[PDB]
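User: what does the whole thing look like in 3D?
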Amino acid sequence: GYQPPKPRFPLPDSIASIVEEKTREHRRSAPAPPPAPKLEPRPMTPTSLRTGCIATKAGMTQEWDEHGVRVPLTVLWVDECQVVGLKTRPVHGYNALMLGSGYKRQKCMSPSEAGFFLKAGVPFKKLVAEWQVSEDALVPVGTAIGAAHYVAGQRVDVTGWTKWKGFQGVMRRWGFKGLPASHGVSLSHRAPGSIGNRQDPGKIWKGKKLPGCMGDERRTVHNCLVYKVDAARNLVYLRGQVPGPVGRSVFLRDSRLASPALRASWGLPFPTHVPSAEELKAAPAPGDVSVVPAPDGPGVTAWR
Amino acid sequence: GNRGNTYQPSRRKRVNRHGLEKRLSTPQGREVLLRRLRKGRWRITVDSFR
Amino acid sequence: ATPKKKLSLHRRGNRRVWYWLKRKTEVAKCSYCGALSGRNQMFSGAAGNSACTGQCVEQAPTPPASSYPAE
Amino acid sequence: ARVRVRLGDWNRLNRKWQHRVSMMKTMVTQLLEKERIRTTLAKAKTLQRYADKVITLGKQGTREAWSEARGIVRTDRELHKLFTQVALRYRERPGGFTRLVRAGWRERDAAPVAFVELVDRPGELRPANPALQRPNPLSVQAWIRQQLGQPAREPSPLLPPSVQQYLREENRIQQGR
RNA sequence: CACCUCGAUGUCGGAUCAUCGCGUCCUGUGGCUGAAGGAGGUCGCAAGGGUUGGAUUGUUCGUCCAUUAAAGUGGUACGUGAUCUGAGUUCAGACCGUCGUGAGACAGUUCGGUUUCUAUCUUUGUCAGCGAAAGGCUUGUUUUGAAACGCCUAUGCACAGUUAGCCGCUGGGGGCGAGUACGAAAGGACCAGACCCCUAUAAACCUCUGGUACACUUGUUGUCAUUUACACGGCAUAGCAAGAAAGCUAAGUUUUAAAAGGCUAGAUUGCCUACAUUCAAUAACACCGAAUGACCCCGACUUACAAAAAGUUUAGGACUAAAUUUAUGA
RNA sequence: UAACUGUCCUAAGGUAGCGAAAUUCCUUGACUUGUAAUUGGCGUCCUGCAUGAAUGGCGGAACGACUGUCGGGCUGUCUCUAACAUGGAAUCUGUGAAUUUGAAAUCUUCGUGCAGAUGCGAAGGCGCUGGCAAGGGACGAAGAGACCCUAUGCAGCUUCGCUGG
RNA sequence: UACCGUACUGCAAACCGACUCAGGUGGGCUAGUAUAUAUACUCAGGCCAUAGAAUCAACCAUGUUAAAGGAACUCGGCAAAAUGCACGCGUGACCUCGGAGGAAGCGUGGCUAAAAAGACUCAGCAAAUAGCCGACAGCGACUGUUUACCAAAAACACAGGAUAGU
RNA sequence: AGUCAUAGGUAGCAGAACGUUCUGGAACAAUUACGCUGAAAACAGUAACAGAAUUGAAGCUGCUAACAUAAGUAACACUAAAUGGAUAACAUGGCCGUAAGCCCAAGGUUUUGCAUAACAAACAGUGAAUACGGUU
RNA sequence: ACGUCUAUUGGACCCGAAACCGAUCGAUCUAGCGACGUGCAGGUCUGACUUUAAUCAGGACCGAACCCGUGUCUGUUGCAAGAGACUGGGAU
Ligand SMILES: [Mg+2]
Ligand SMILES: [Mg+2]
Ligand SMILES: [Mg+2]
Ligand SMILES: [Mg+2]
Ligand SMILES: [Mg+2]
Ligand SMILES: [Mg+2]
Ligand SMILES: [Mg+2]
Ligand SMILES: [Mg+2]
Ligand SMILES: [Mg+2]
Ligand SMILES: [Mg+2]
Ligand SMILES: [Mg+2]
Ligand SMILES: [Mg+2]
Ligand SMILES: [Mg+2]
Ligand SMILES: [Mg+2]
Ligand SMILES: [Mg+2]
Ligand SMILES: [Mg+2]
Ligand SMILES: [Mg+2]
Ligand SMILES: [Mg+2]
Ligand SMILES: [Mg+2]
Ligand SMILES: [Mg+2]
Ligand SMILES: [Mg+2]
Ligand SMILES: [Mg+2]
Ligand SMILES: [Mg+2]
Ligand SMILES: [Mg+2]
Ligand SMILES: [Mg+2]
Ligand SMILES: [Mg+2]
Ligand SMILES: [Mg+2]
Ligand SMILES: [Mg+2]
Ligand SMILES: [Mg+2]
Ligand SMILES: [Mg+2]
Ligand SMILES: [Mg+2]
Ligand SMILES: [Mg+2]
Ligand SMILES: [Mg+2]
Ligand SMILES: [Mg+2]
Ligand SMILES: [Mg+2]
Ligand SMILES: [Zn+2]
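Assistant: Here's the predicted 3D structure for the full assembly of 602 residues, as structure tokens:
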């Protein structure tokens, strides 16, 4: 799936001396890369973009609010999400944070990709992604991005890859109506119907809806609420559905759809949840459950 | 109704129609036999044997 | 639902690409009897191998057991 | 069209379900009469699952188990073998009474072929592993099995010495009534 | 008119699915208003997406039932039979009426009356294969210009422009604003700016509610087997009937702002101990999985506070090794 | 309205009993019912384009794989489709056709043109080749006769067409 | 007490259809539950050879089930669904007095009881077989016949009647 | 042998030639041909002069034969159901059972039996003796 | 006279009809007739005869064997140059 790449004529007629000296004096005169960011808590600039998260769908459950209404709650789990790489405006063309999640053994990963983690000094992640971030949002390599990055009542934009269903016809892929079951219709109860329009168009359109293998598609659900965050167990409880099956990782970000630059007064820590007293925290061991926050909302039964 | 099976075999009817004696019974049947002889057919009638 | 012209030798060869078989990159060879098969399959005398001399299995000692033969 | 492989369930084997259960009953009866049978991979995997179910039912040794096996297992010469030789042979084995070895393809239809046989018998093709593995009381596993509620589960003879002091008694025979 | 096809080529309908124009019915809007804001008449811009019911006619014509913000008009061989119908326009049977001496004619009414085709390549949807390299290192080094080592990039792989191209593209109604500015007065708004409800469309999901569930559980009829007409087994649509869990699904549940969102190619940057076999013949389970320092699969045991998908376990398969464990606290 | 009288060519101007009917142009015939809404039926009425005792007029029991309409029950026909079962289809192995075919290495739009272009002109696009699907185009394929016209054309039939024993 | 037939096949891979063709092909014999040669299972007997192997495509064919509705679909309830059985009650108009008519509509059914009765099941015509019903018209009195290969009808015939000839 | 003039063509008309088979002139290939070119074309490279023609073919939905394409595509779905290392004798399971069982007729006319490949059709097989059917 | 080109009569440059006139063969398909023989499970209703009783009638009714092909669907170089499934009509 690539064009024929390069004719690559080698002979430069001896102008190669000028280009080699120009390249040597171009790399050596480029600026030194900026220092390690070393982030502590920072101010909330209104036009500043935060990082995202790689969370794992764990299924759906039932909860009732204090007002007494059932809410469909999916539960996501943050699998040791850390910052693996970094891109910034001086050395790269853009300013981004590269995130990693999960874990894989050394024998289970390709040697070209394992070398990247061994150079970075981070464990071998199973998924690597990146998010565009502002200049003041560059968090250093090795920093965890857990459930505490998000707050209860926040609206997020979850991105997921849909369940695979295989090849289906236009009845359930495009939702087309077919022909009647019993009025003389011959062998065409699930036919797509007319596809072109005769000699004057003379062809089928480039965007025609025809049967195909739907499934595994990157669909984003926009502006979904966060109902509960368990910081100790890395659990976030979104309300509503998340695309994808259970066990597949999904992407999260602050909802840019609801963006007045105020972030709707959500209590978002800007660089990440910079943890104070990181000591006195147990490793995977005999730990217990912790406390969580939740939004309330007003008048779900204001009248009948 | 499927066609194609007009030939219903019967030895009595075959010998009684196209046999030697009905050919010899009438004059024009005898000239039928005579031109079968003039053509040179190895089988003169449907019921000839030896 | 019907070809309008006759297919050329070049176009026929291009269309017949799905019909060709891929070569296998591994084979399990018995050093004695020279038999050839996959690494996940038995190809000794119990399976089809008229050339088997039993040297394919190099050790099989199991004398002791005790049970009730139902007769 | 219902999903059987990919959603753990029984194979369809190109047959209606009543034909499918009857064919599996015939094959499990044949598997215990001659202890190694050869068939296609799909029947071989289905036979392995069915053999585990039937062998455990014979291992129960109860009257209801005999009644259920009487319909499941056809021969009756081999209903005795399942309840006596097979039950005593695998009395302490936690499943996995059968192994599968692939044997290539068959001539009539190029279908993959597997050898399916009972393990732990004279005439098997790989040495079995012991069903139990007596624990060292001076190792980590034994202490984990003391702090947590696990039994000893040691290898045992058919009649251990814990019944010897009952059976030795001449006043516990009842004369045979 | 008869220029094109009689080596015969679907129109005079709707069923599904479309694309485009604006001479705009609505939604978004500006001017003139005989302009009380309402409610109207024009006129100017704007084609994003919306235009529903069915009762009657073979009718694309038309009403009139009553709902909406509205129930748009056209190019589409008055779009669309190698997707569907043949209800009407081409016959063959018959009757009634008209004309005819009669064979017969009727674009007068009726009843009945064969819709063939396995996709070559042009499009289109989707899923895949092929598109090799090592170049010189005068090797930075070594003697016994060949051997690997060190370099620039070359492929591969990963993240992939404040980076190309392309697709989708953001629907409304009623309240609250307001018993209101207005207005003798009845009569009631522009602003949608935001909140509450609904309804579409689009994208998902199975948490709820249901449907289905054919090796699940219960009850039962006939009959064949049954040295017990105890239990169990076969067949009768799974024999029948009832109730089920996973999975799928909608009638269910969420989300649908300026730009959001997706698809394909990709300057760069980074990395490289990468010949690609097995775990089931349709991996779609599984590459964001495993192959013995392995719970990947399968089996076994337990769970009614899972009417069953989790937990333990290396029993079996993904073979494999020894001089401190046939081996992970899997 | 024309019942009785007045007229003209004329075999004679159609009775009790029929009629927008198998057959009535106006047509959605005014009239009642039928439905919320009826041009297709039912029962009246009259204005019979182009009805009517041997082309038999007037209705009836029973009968009809005949035709047009109304109620009850019933249900996926439908609102609006979903799951499952069996057998094809899709994968592999074995056997193994035909329709079609000037040669092809066959892009899009606009224009031109035997007047609807893959092949011409202008501009643009396109790594290459397939599997599985959908059928808008190739005026797809299948019949040198669907319909109209013509022939020193045939054939059969009809008659107060012509000629014949 | 001679002559001819005597193999094999004969609802079929051996006959008639170009075929190992889903078509057409005459007569006879037969066991039980049981009762009819129908229906479900089975006896004697026969068969499971003429493509096989797994699997979750879409789609097609044939079916099962489906919440709330129910002809709203459609030229037209076309196609499906529904009634479908033996013992009792009952039972319209119209009519050629025969019929309509099984009108319509409602009870009673398996199993145990040498027996006045009962058990429990959601379900007792328990599985398979065995009419949808009523009303208004049109046409043809009726049963029949008709275009083998798109029309089974109001077309043809029919008993009867009239006329003409002999 | 140097100058001038002419040379687009359908229907049509006129002129010059090439090639195929056979014959006459006594016999022009017994022992082959093969320097790979020549010519304006038809063509030539095994005479020439005359003559006799079933004398020249991409072109008639022509006829015959062979070979492709579609394409290793469609098809190998009416049914009872198969399993065990075999279209198994044995075992297990299933299907018909007013037939898918048995006995005949019409019709067919040897399609009927024998070998764990094989050298086997070349070999076998139809018996009227119960008052069997026919012939009368 | 020979040679060439036209013209007339011939099939007369070649191939192609629908046709017309005679006299062969075909009722083994199908239509009618004729002779001989055979078949119509199970029930239901009505009328008649005889009854100590093993009889007849109805172009009667429901329904197998058998005959036919109404509607729908499948199939359309099909299983079949007219078939299959389910509904159907007749069945003294
Ligand atoms: Mg059809
Ligand atoms: Mg028939
Ligand atoms: Mg013939
Ligand atoms: Mg299927
Ligand atoms: Mg069954
Ligand atoms: Mg669930
Ligand atoms: Mg279950
Ligand atoms: Mg049985
Ligand atoms: Mg599905
Ligand atoms: Mg193991
Ligand atoms: Mg299948
Ligand atoms: Mg054009
Ligand atoms: Mg493609
Ligand atoms: Mg294709
Ligand atoms: Mg003329
Ligand atoms: Mg038959
Ligand atoms: Mg045939
Ligand atoms: Mg046959
Ligand atoms: Mg049976
Ligand atoms: Mg078979
Ligand atoms: Mg219901
Ligand atoms: Mg019943
Ligand atoms: Mg009758
Ligand atoms: Mg009749
Ligand atoms: Mg010239
Ligand atoms: Mg000139
Ligand atoms: Mg000579
Ligand atoms: Mg010639
Ligand atoms: Mg193949
Ligand atoms: Mg066998
Ligand atoms: Mg015979
Ligand atoms: Mg002359
Ligand atoms: Mg004759
Ligand atoms: Mg019948
Ligand atoms: Mg009937
Ligand atoms: Zn070997």
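In plain terms: Residues 182, 184, 186-187 of chain A lie near RNA strand I (CB under 10 Å from a C1'). The helical segments of chain A are 16-27, 111-120.
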